[PDB]
Amino acid sequence: KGKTFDFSDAQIFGKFDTFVRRLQKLIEIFSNIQQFNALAKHNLEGMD
């Protein structure tokens, strides 16, 4: 707004995007692991 003379285009293609996707994978993997633990404890009388 005060420096419209020059711009630096969005260079958002860094390692942080890939590894934040990695962390999303970890989040979903482990949350579904969580829910499946209890659900398997509900499903099959053979818990072990």
Place this chain on the structure above:
Amino acid sequence: SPNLCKSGPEIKQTEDKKAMEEFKNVKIE
């Protein structure tokens, strides 16, 4: 007579079984 008793799990594991039924309630939830 073959279905008389199992003699190991019924006797002292029965309180544990009632606790397990309460666990099945926590499971229902």
